[PDB]
């Protein structure tokens, strides 16, 4: 297991990161998180679905709708790509700080 405190800081950035690869939807995103982390991080549904809500409200992603049978898909916005890049730079600084002490 990993730091809950750090991961809380990066949930949105991790979801944005997957959306930069391609448009996606709730179940695919959480599936992709656990698989790509080698099972080290499995995201809670409540964590995931309040993140979408926040990401949308903030204007970092947009919803759209598949065919009726309707699935909600998200696509990352230019404003969401810029938030992602800021958080990437932040992660680099965060790492630099903690690697000094935690060796």
Binding site for its own copies (CB under 8 A): 1-10, 13-14, 17-18, 36-37, 40-41, 87-88, 90-91, 93-98, 100-103
The residue (of 65 and 101) whose beta carbon lies closer to its own copies is 101
Burial per residue of 5-15, b for 16 or more beta-carbon CB atoms within 10 angstroms, e otherwise? eeeeebbbbbb
What is the x/- site pattern for Hg ion, positions 71-100, by CB under 5 A?
Answer: -----------------xx-----------
Minimal distance, residue 70 CB to Hg ion, in Å: 25
Helix axes 45-57, 26-36, angle to 10 degrees: 120
Quick one: residue 76, left, alpha or beta (phi over 0 = left, psi -120 to 50 = alpha)? beta
């Amino acid at each position: 297991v990993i730091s809950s405190d750090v991961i809380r800081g990066y949930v949105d950035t991790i979801i944005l990161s997957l959306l930069i690869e391609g448009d996606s939807y709730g179940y695919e995103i959480s599936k992709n998180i656990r698989i790509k982390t080698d099972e080290l991080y499995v995201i809670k549904e409540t964590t995931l679905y309040s993140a979408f809500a926040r990401l949308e409200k903030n204007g970092y992603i947009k919803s759209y709708y598949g065919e009726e049978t309707r699935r909600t898909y998200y696509r990352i916005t230019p404003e969401g790509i810029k938030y992602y890049k800021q958080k990437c730079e932040e992660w680099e600084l965060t790492k630099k700080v903690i690697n000094k002490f935690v060796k």
